[PDB]
Amino acid sequence: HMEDIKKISIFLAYNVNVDAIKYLKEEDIQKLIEEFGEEEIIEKIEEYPRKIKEPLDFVARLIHAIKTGKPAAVPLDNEELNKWFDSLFKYDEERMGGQVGIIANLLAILDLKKVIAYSPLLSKKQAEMFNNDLLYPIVENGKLVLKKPIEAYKDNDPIKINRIFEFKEGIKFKLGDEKIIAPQANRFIVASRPENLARIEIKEDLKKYLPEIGEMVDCAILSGYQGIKEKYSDGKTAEYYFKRAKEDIKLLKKKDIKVHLEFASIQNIKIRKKVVDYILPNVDSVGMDETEIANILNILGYEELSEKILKDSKIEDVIEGAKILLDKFNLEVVQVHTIYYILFISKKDNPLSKEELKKTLEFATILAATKAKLGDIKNIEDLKVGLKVPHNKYGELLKEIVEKLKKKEDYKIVLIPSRFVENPKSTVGLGDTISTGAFVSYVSLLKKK
Numbered sequence: 001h002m003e004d005i006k007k008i009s010i011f012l013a014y015n016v017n018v019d020a021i022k023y024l025k026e027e028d029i030q031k032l033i034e035e036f037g038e039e040e041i042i043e044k045i046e047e048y049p050r051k052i053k054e055p056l057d058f059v060a061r062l063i064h065a066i067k068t069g070k071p072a073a074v075p076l077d078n079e080e081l082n083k084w085f086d087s088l089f090k091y092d093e094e095r096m097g098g099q100v101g102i103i104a105n106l107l108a109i110l111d112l113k114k115v116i117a118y119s120p121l122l123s124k125k126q127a128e129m130f131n132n133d134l135l136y137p138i139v140e141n142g143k144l145v146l147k148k149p150i151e152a153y154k155d156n157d158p159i160k161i162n163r164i165f166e167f168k169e170g171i172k173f174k175l176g177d178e179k180i181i182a183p184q185a186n187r188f189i190v191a192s193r194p195e196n197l198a199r200i201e202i203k204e205d206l207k208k209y210l211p212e213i214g215e216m217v218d219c220a221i222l223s224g225y226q227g228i229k230e231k232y233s234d235g236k237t238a239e240y241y242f243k244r245a246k247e248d249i250k251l252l253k254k255k256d257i258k259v260h261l262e263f264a265s266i267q268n269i270k271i272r273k274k275v276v277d278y279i280l281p282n283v284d285s286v287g288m289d290e291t292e293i294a295n296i297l298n299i300l301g302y303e304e305l306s307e308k309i310l311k312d313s314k315i316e317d318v319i320e321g322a323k324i325l326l327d328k329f330n331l332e333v334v335q336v337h338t339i340y341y342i343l344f345i346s347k348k349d350n351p352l353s354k355e356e357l358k359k360t361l362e363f364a365t366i367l368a369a370t371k372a373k374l375g376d377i378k379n380i381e382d383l384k385v386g387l388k389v390p391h392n393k394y395g396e397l398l399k400e401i402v403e404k405l406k407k408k409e410d411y412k413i414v415l416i417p418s419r420f421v422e423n424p425k426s427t428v429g430l431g432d433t434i435s436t437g438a439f440v441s442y443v444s445l446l447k448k449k
């Protein structure tokens with residue numbers, strides 16, 4: 001369990017935010033009903049507002065989402081309503097949000113050699129969420145300077161905050177003559193994609209220093225493409241920002257680094273196709289689940305294979321879909337993870353051995369089990385709790401099937417069962433945790449060679 005991971009430097013971009021979370025109870029929803037009126041809410045629920053313009057909009061959309069138990073996200077109509085919303089519906093706790101912020105703080109906890117995180121906005125309240133060991137790129141006096149986020153914040157900068165409302169399964173309240181029971185625990189999110197506050201991009205002053213960043217770094221993890229809009233009020237489009245994102249990878253890759261992408265669940269099929277066209281063909285590693293790999297194969301035209309994966313979920317079909325992704329997009333490794341297993345596929349000429357790829361995946365299952373059972377990771381010593389979680393029994397059966405499948409190839413295929421937690425404290429961002437552990441451990445073993 002010796003960690004060669006600490007010898008790795010990494011760059012992260014682009015999405016960082018603050019998560020203000022409210023843990024709802026029956027008493028909280030009852031107070032909203034009395035304050036705003038049972039009859040006005042019912043009338044508003046039939047209206048089904050697309051955006052929240054008055055406090056009654058948030059109340060109606062929240063109750064509507066609890067009734068279905070399905071996730072829902074509704075933005076505020078205007079950014080000038082932020083202070084009014086926060087003073088009206090107070091939070092329980094604030095913490096770091098976003099794929100960059102969460103993973104960077106975790107990598108800083110794991111004593112990585114150098115962790116450079118970048119985000120467009122850096123207010124004082126946001127810069128205090130970062131770990132003190134993190135570094136933020138700044139241009140001053142015509143040179144690239146890495147300084148700590150608390151020493152590089154800006155007072156005039158806006159802040160991006162996601163207001164999250166969690167409700168447990170079976171929360172019961174009465175609205176009118178209807179009795180409402182939550183069929184499933186879920187989250188209702190009040191958040192906005194960046195426009196007129198910031199943009200998903202590396203600013204023009206830092207773009208000339210991306211190759212210099214790629215020299216002092218071993219690998220990069222890029223995320224946040226789901227926040228790009230189709231059109232913008234100033235006249236810019238998604239193509240404008242996806243082209244520049246393609247430029248950032250090319251500038252970073254003028255030096256020898258590995259770039260990793262975690263395939264996020266993007267509802268917009270048009271932005272999802274942009275990530276397949278602009279980002280995926282230009283990175284070196286990709287991680288996803290069974291649902292997203294079927295979405296990718298569907299975009300590539302393998303509709304017959306996409307339907308088999310979503311309907312039956314047999315490992316032999318998922319393996320065949322990952323081999324299509326590997327050969328088409330100049331990738332080095334494809335990683336597929338579920339609740340039962342995590343699959344790893346590389347080409348035959350990969351410098352790592354079969355047993356080394358297993359050790360890479362064994363670290364990913366320990367880091368994931370720790371976060372699922374503990375709910376959060378605050379110290380390196382906490383990994384011993386994830387070690388206590390035994391392997392999935394059904395995944396051991398899948399492992400034997402993969403060994404037998406190799407009866408007659410140019411691929412290194414490794415399967416390992418996942419350390420499943422029966423009663424996890426949380427499940428948000430667990431896919432980013434497994435994928436980061438596998439990629440970071442994979443870059444470690446390549447560095448030894």
Ligand SMILES: Nc1ncnc2c1ncn2[C@@H]1O[C@H](COP(=O)(O)O)[C@@H](O)[C@H]1O
Binds near residue numbers: 337339369
């Ligand atoms: N109770 C659990 N114990 C361990 N791992 C889990 C548990 N629930 C979910 N996971 C992992 O979380 C991943 C979710 O990633 P995603 O759906 O891509 O965000 C799954 O593929 C599982 O590997």
